Design a protein around this ligand. Structure first.
Ligand code: FMN
Ligand code: SF4
Ligand code: SF4
Ligand code: SF4
Ligand code: FES
Ligand code: FES
Ligand code: K
Lengths: 263, 87, 42, 213, 431
């Protein structure tokens, strides 16, 4: 009825009003690069990795936050779009630490994978890097905060999903730091989910630390039994040993979260 | 967040015993199908392959994420709870 | 006269001058609107 | 300048702080400025009030502000660390803030900064032993035509020379309050040596008012 | 029409107490024509007031120059049940700019009446005046003027006897140049970090407290009472077409008499410096470069300054911008590289850190610029620096990222030999 027509790379798609540019692209099977955006968190628009060109429009728009307009043609592979991604990736990697060999995220890192797919193949940053101090938020989540890319996913999850306003940002500019300011533990019954949403190895699982790499684990799709909710999980095993538990998306049960006891 | 590994259908078999090699402690197996994974374009293709090979199978419906209503302006609501306390 | 400075009152302003003025202005203000709840967390 | 709090004997959640009964009346006026259901709008003025009462913001002062307004303490910490006018460490009785941005840099704000350093004997970012002065550099203070300028607490001292600032500091040590404003002949932002404009009596009411009201 | 501009008469000047010679309180302001027939203006209704501002050609004095009448008209729509607000941007943070400081402390009643006249045209119930926290005395003057207006019946319940209820609140910032950005300012009023919002939504739809809002510069608001009193056509009779009216100019830096003055739009840049500011230090031939509109606008060399007119369109043709019309003058004794490097250091200190290209990019440019000051770099890095700034520009949430890329582009565009000449000098002393 009220569907409006937009185009993705010239292909017409009908979407409801209020659909974002990022959502319009999904309907034709394209995934826009992202870091700060998460479909179950409030829109942020800060990482700028989703910038995309609208045809015959001088400025690129943040695909995650921009509602589509009737007749828009979204050029998701244009030279302007591709050069926006390369610039943003370059800024993300400027201060990032050369940690991949010792970082648990290695092999299942969105920063690694989107650098490979959408970024340049080399560096022209000739300066020294930022280094941030680490923060203790309890025994379940390890924080190597020099890896943080300031996407604020953890802050939005802590506030909106767990209902806890303990995480935030302090300072500003290049020195803006995610944390609790004071020495405080983040020990919600849902706290372990900030490990999953964090796109980098800034927040990692303390119990899982260093034990395995992603490519070598076999994934068994199973069901949690720590409660009567029936959360869908993936058991990760390696060489006949259970290594970790991850959530498995089920919209009508656990969405994509699990409790700390399950995890 | 990438969704490119959720595009195709897979066929895998039931997991069987893995035990520790006495010499080195490696994980030993007597199951020839432990690593056998097959890719299919559609559910029908996978079922047809299992029927003609005689294997008992369980099929599971594809889980597609629900469409969400996203609104950046909801972060600044005049009177709703969606108003955020930090950016 | 156009030869002398006439903004010398702030020479005798103090720490609470601005907030004292805000407090004294409170009686002239209109009733505030309400969003219907004590806060976004209610 | 660290943006993480570490408890100390003098700065910990049990450090005594509370608004005086008079500052509670002022806080009532502040809160009434904003729509009902949006008390969080008062966070900046109430934090600033606590600084005016206390001289700086201990973690207990931030926790007090959060409690009054029913906002999470983290949302008060974010404001406290975002805005540079909030002092999360004690400062001298006189906070000297020397502008060093380019327009003041062009008018020799370095000579002013070195003159203060040489006199008080403290490098930028330090406090004097008697705890009367704290010296820092700041960005443009919105008084560029009157450069080089400094701000001591709530007052601006402008069109300065190394001699002028040493004179001001001497008055502060003596306990006198020096007069804010230009230390050259002029009064505010007029051109020196005579007005090139507004040399006529200002016109009166209803001058050039268009027909039709 | 008019071919030359400038040499404005005192009778046509709006801020007739710019230098604070005459009394700044209610008595003095009324003697200068303020608060005159304000009742009549209010009863003319929002459409007429908006027509006055549309006809006058007023463009935003905050640094972006949007046509005000069109902008304010976004609020001229039926209510949705939410209150509507006017926010006056008095953050006054742009380096080199210090004109709103004079209006707030010497002509406060023009602003207060501006809030009422501008507020009525938007159907706003109140005006929130955001003022930088450093202007403590200036914000105290403004509160006396507001209190006088309340006690004289000029604002408040049944303002000016017009039957319209309007309030004026003053809100002080706490040290953040980013809080002059319109959405960052709105966030600060709500008690959050001064972090700009993405657009849409636009403030006229969702603004302060989530309500329809308009943010207007102090200078833009403070002139709308006179544009209505004296007529929009009178205002449009100054300056070139689409660059109408008078304008407050700050001339600072290497001039003999740094000052704030009001002049006609499209006045020649050379005329403005020489007539009011007493000329460049060491004479005109000593001029090296000028930043014509605050730190954000790219510099321009002496040759361009010979004939360039001071208005929005003329400065765009010179690959710069009018900005806030804060003229920073640099003579040949200046270290042009260091002067710009200190400007990048300013933006590095002011970035809110919210979005990636400015959080990491501006700091990156600051380090490169610092090295360019000593020549501890290679010429191939200049084009790298140019590319980096283009990656920041147009890819950030707000215009601070653009404002930190333009000064770098201006330096590279006009003083590349100076950069390459410093690198060559550094290299030889290190062999
Ligand atoms: C970093 C930054 C700082 C700004 N600072 C100010 C300021 O101090 N005063 C101001 O009026 N506008 C400032 N602006 C411009 C505002 O965002 C906005 O365009 C202006 O307030 C609109 O008012 P106007 O249309 O009446 O000019 C700033 C913009 C940016 C990006
Ligand atoms: S977060 Fe990703 S890119 Fe960064 S060190 Fe870890 S694996 Fe490498
Ligand atoms: S810790 Fe991870 S999730 Fe949180 S802001 Fe940093 S990168 Fe984002
Ligand atoms: S461009 Fe800079 S100041 Fe503007 S939102 Fe991004 S980080 Fe903040
Ligand atoms: S995914 Fe859109 S800006 Fe981060
Ligand atoms: S540059 Fe120093 S007050 Fe503006
Ligand atoms: K992670």
């Amino acid at each position: 009825s009220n569907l409006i027509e937009v185009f993705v790379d010239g292909q017409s798609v009908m979407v409801e009003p209020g659909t974002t540019v990022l959502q319009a692209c999904e309907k034709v099977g394209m995934q826009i690069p992202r870091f700060c955006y998460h479909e179950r968190l409030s829109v942020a628009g800060n990482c700028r990795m989703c910038l995309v060109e609208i045809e015959k429009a001088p400025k690129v728009v943040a695909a995650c936050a921009m509602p589509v307009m009737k007749g828009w043609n979204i050029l998701t592979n244009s030279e302007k779009t591709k050069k926006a991604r390369e610039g943003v990736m370059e800024f993300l990697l400027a201060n990032h630490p050369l940690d991949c060999p010792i970082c648990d995220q290695g092999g299942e890192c969105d920063l690694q994978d989107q650098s490979m797919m959408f970024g340049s193949d080399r560096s022209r940053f000739l300066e020294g890097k930022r280094a941030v101090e680490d923060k203790n938020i309890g025994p379940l989540v390890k924080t190597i905060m020099t890896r943080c890319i300031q996407c604020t996913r953890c802050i939005r999850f802590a506030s909106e999903i767990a209902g806890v306003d303990d995480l935030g940002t302090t300072g500003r500019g290049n020195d803006m730091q995610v944390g609790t300011y004071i020495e405080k533990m983040f020990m919600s019954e849902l706290s372990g989910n900030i490990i999953d949403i964090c796109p980098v190895g800034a927040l990692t699982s303390k119990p899982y630390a260093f034990t395995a790499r992603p490519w070598e684990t076999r994934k068994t799709e199973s069901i949690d039994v720590m409660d009567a909710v029936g959360s869908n999980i993936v058991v990760s095993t390696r060489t006949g040993e259970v290594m970790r538990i991850l959530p498995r998306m089920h919209e009508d049960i656990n969405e994509e979260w699990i409790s700390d006891k399950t995890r | 967040s990438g969704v490119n590994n959720t595009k195709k259908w897979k066929m895998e078999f039931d997991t069987r015993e893995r035990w520790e090699n006495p010499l080195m402690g490696w994980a030993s197996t007597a199951d020839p199908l432990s690593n056998l994974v097959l890719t299919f374009s559609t559910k029908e293709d996978a079922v047809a392959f299992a029927e003609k090979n005689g294997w008992s199978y369980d099929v599971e419906e594809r889980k597609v994420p629900k469409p969400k209503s996203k609104s950046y302006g909801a972060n600044f609501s005049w009177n709703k709870r969606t108003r955020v306390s930090t950016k | 006269d156009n030869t002398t400075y006439k903004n010398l009152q702030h020479h005798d302003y103090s720490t609470y001058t601005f907030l004292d003025l805000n407090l004294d202005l409170s009686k002239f203000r209109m009733p505030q609107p309400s969003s219907g709840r004590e806060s976004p967390r209610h | 300048a660290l943006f993480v709090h570490r408890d100390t004997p003098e700065n910990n959640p049990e450090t005594p702080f509370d608004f005086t009964p008079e500052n509670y009346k002022r806080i009532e006026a502040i809160v009434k400025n904003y729509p009902e259901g949006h008390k969080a709008a008062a966070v900046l003025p109430v934090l600033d009030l606590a600084q005016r009462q206390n001289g700086w913001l201990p973690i207990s002062a931030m926790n007090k502000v959060a409690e009054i307004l029913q906002v999470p303490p983290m949302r008060v910490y974010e404001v406290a660390t975002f805005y540079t006018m909030y002092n999360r460490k004690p400062v001298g009785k006189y906070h000297i803030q020397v502008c060093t941005t380019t327009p003041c840099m062009l008018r020799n704000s370095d000579s002013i900064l070195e003159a203060i350093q040489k006199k008080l004997g403290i490098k930028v970012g330090e406090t004097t032993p008697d705890k009367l002065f704290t010296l820092i550099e700041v960005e443009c203070l919105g008084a560029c035509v009157n450069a080089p300028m400094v701000q001591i607490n709530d007052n601006y001292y402008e069109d300065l020379t190394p001699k002028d600032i040493e004179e001001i500091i001497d008055e502060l040590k003596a306990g006198k309050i020096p007069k804010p404003g230009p230390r050259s002949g002029r009064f505010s932002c007029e051109p020196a040596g005579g007005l090139t404009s507004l040399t006529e009596p200002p016109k009166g009411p209803g001058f050039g008012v268009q027909a039709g009201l | 029409k008019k071919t030359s501009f400038g040499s404005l008469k005192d009778e046509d000047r709006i801020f007739t107490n710019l230098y604070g010679r005459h009394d700044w309180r209610l008595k003095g302001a009324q003697s200068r024509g303020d608060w005159y027939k304000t009742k009549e203006i209010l009863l003319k209704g929002p459409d007429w007031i908006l027509g006055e501002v549309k006809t006058s050609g007023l463009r935003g004095r905050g640094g972006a120059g949007f046509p005000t009448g069109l902008k304010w008209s976004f609020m001229n729509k039926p209510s949705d049940g939410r209150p509507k607000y006017l926010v006056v941007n008095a953050d006054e943070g742009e380096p080199g700019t210090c004109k709103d400081r004079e209006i707030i402390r010497h002509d406060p009643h023009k602003l207060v009446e501006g809030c009422l006249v501008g507020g009525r045209a938007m159907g706003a119930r109140a005006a929130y005046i955001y003022i930088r926290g450093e202007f403590y005395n200036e914000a105290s003057n403004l509160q006396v003027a507001i209190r006088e207006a309340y006690e004289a019946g000029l604002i408040g319940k049944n303002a000016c006897g017009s039957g319209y209820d309007f309030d004026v609140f003053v809100v002080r910032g706490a040290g953040a140049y980013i809080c002059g950005e319109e959405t960052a300012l709105i966030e600060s009023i709500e008690g959050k970090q001064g972090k700009p919002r993405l657009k849409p939504p636009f403030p006229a739809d969702v603004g302060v407290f989530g309500c329809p809002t308009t943010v207007a510069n102090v200078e833009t608001v403070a002139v709308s009472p006179t544009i209505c009193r004296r007529g929009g056509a009178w205002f449009a009779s100054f300056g070139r077409e689409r660059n109408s009216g008078t304008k407050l100019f700050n001339i600072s830096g290497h001039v003999n008499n740094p000052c704030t003055v009001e002049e006609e739009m499209s006045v020649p840049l050379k005329e403005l410096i020489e007539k009011h500011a007493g000329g460049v230090t060491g004479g005109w031939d000593n001029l090296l470069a000028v930043i014509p509109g605050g730190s954000s606008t790219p510099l321009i060399p002496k040759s361009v300054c010979e004939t360039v007119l001071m208005d929005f369109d003329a400065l765009i043709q010179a690959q710069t911008g009018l900005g806030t019309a804060a003229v920073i003058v640099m003579d040949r004794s200046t270290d042009i590289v260091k002067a710009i490097a200190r400007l990048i250091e300013f933006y590095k200190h002011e970035s809110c850190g919210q979005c990636t290209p400015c959080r990491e990019g501006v700091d990156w440019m600051n380090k490169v610029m610092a090295r360019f000051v000593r020549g501890d770099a290679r010429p191939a890095e200049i084009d790298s620096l140019w590319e980096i700034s283009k990656q920041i520009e147009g890819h950030t949430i707000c215009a601070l990222g653009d404002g930190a890329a333009w000064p770098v582009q201006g330096l590279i565009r006009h003083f590349r030999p100076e950069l390459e000449e410093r690198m060559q000098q550094f290299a030889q002393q290190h062999q």
